[PDB]
Design a binder for this molecule. Structure first.
Ligand SMILES: *[C@@H]1O[C@H](CO)[C@@H](O[C@@H]2O[C@H](CO)[C@@H](O[C@@H]3O[C@H](CO)[C@@H](O)[C@H](O[C@H]4O[C@H](CO)[C@@H](O)[C@H](O)[C@@H]4O)[C@@H]3O)[C@H](O)[C@H]2NC(C)=O)[C@H](O)[C@H]1NC(C)=O
Ligand SMILES: C[C@@H]1O[C@@H](O)[C@H](O)[C@H](O)[C@H]1O
Ligand code: NA
Length: 419
């Protein structure tokens, strides 16, 4: 496997402040291909300047030829909170509507939707008036909508879309799922699906494939990030309503963080393992988790693999040149190609201030990690486009540069793979 071509685009100037608002690990998602177009969302500085931002949404054509990015500015909602939690997630439903949820740290939901199915019936003109106002509920569904952190979208197989988030706080919180029907345009509540017990679960993402929804998490006791413990897993065969552990044992609804039956790896507190890193269902149905810890004696990225024979394995990702991250360093992701043979570790390096793209193969039990490419000059939690990789064999990555405002840009890097 080799890179046929490498291209980059600067899509905006990052915002100024002591927190990272763009390129955050739990954006789900920031960069999405739907039909023939790719979409991206990020904050840019509003005319009021420092500590005033607007959400932007970019689009470009990617099939059958790649066209130029164009952007709209949502200049009716000013993001003002310098808190690295307050990121943006986007989702696109099978009616073509684009959904955005953003700007939360233990506050009520902030959500909006396109008026029409602009990703299906693609308008000529790309402007802000394609979006409805910001609302603080999900029409058709019910609360609680506060205190909300971590909106995550997952597109389902019938065009529907899940929206998942935590209600409560670090060290004491629960998570919920809501489902948007593409056929009716109404949301419905799936309710609480994981319940804390004077702690909170921190999921790594949502992964849906062929009618099954997968997630993994750690449990956090207190607002101190050293108090994470365990690596957990569950899946659902009904889009979030009911859940099973790794042994196909049905769980209680909601899943309790006290139920050890979802534990797949014992990781104590003070292991230097961070919440909300990376997960992946590959296209052959093997589940993968990216975490980190110091348990070997050195800080290293860790790959957890749920094998087909049922067994979990854990292997350090330690290819030559990769500096291992500590608790607070940027978080990575895992991506997969259409075949399921290739696993990509998209791993920010805290020494180099760059993002390494490493590849392992299913034939080698993913032990063969190798440096494939690098995105230089990043201070970001890199985020990729799942669909674009599956459909075209292009690994497309959204990144915040390193460096100082206003030199520090937002970019999309495309690695055309020789698949
Ligand atoms: C429900 O699922 C859980 C989670 O997967 C599962 O618990 C796991 O069971 C495995 C298999 O027993 C445990 O793995 C072993 O851990 C012990 C530590 O006491 C070691 O002895 C084992 O190492 C030997 O066996 C390995 C087999 O591959 C060899 O590679 C190794 O070199 C040794 O010979 C092995 O690692 C694992 O600890 C648990 N995990 C947890 C989190 O509890 C449980 O069994 C499932 N229950 C049912 C009813 O299916
Ligand atoms: C460790 C800490 O954990 C949560 O508060 C969020 O994931 C935040 O982004 C991360 O920095
Ligand atoms: Na607690």
């Amino acid at each position: 496997l080799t890179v046929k071509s490498t291209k980059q685009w600067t899509i905006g100037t990052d915002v100024q402040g002591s927190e990272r608002l763009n390129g955050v690990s739990y954006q789900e998602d920031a960069l999405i291909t739907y039909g023939d177009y790719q979409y991206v969302t990020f904050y840019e500085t509003a005319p009021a300047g420092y500590l005033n931002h607007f959400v932007k949404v970019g689009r470009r054509r990617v099939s059958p030829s790649v066209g130029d990015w164009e952007f709209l500015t949502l200049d009716d909602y000013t993001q003002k909170t310098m808190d690295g939690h307050n990121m943006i997630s986007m989702g696109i439903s099978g009616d073509g509507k684009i959904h955005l949820s953003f700007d939360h740290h233990d506050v009520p939901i902030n959500y909006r939707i396109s008026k029409n199915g602009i990703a299906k019936d693609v308008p000529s003109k790309w402007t802000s008036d394609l979006f409805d106002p910001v609302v603080h509920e999900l029409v058709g569904s019910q609360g609680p909508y506060s205190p909300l952190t971590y909106p995550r979208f997952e597109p389902l197989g019938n065009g529907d879309l899940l929206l998942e988030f935590r209600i409560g706080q670090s060290g004491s919180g629960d998570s919920y799922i809501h489902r948007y029907s593409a056929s009716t345009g109404k949301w419905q509540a799936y309710g609480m699906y994981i319940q804390g017990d004077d702690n909170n679960a921190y999921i790594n993402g949502l992964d849906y494939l062929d009618g099954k929804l997968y997630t993994s998490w750690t449990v956090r006791e207190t607002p101190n990030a050293d108090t994470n413990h365990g690596v957990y897993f569950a899946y659902s065969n009904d889009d979030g309503k009911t859940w099973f552990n790794t042994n196909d044992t049905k769980l209680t609804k909601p899943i309790s963080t006290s139920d050890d039956s979802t534990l797949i790896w014992d990781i104590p507190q003070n292991s230097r393992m961070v919440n909300q890193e990376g997960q992946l269902i590959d296209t052959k149905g093997r589940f993968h988790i990216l975490m980190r810890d110091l348990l070997s004696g050195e800080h290293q990225y860790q790959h957890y693999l749920r094998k087909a024979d049922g067994t979990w394995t854990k292997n350090a990702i330690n290819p030559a040149g990769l500096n291992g991250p500590d608790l607070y360093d940027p978080r990575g992701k895992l991506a997969g190609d259409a075949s399921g043979e290739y696993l990509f570790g998209i791993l920010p390096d805290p020494v180099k201030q760059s993002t390494g793209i490493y590849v392992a193969t299913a034939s080698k039990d993913f032990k063969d990690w190798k440096s494939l490419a690098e995105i230089p000059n990043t201070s970001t939690e890199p985020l990729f486009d799942k669909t674009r990789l599956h459909e075209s064999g292009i690994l497309s990555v959204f990144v915040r540069q390193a460096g100082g405002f206003p030199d520090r840009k937002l970019q999309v890097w495309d690695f055309e793979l020789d698949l």
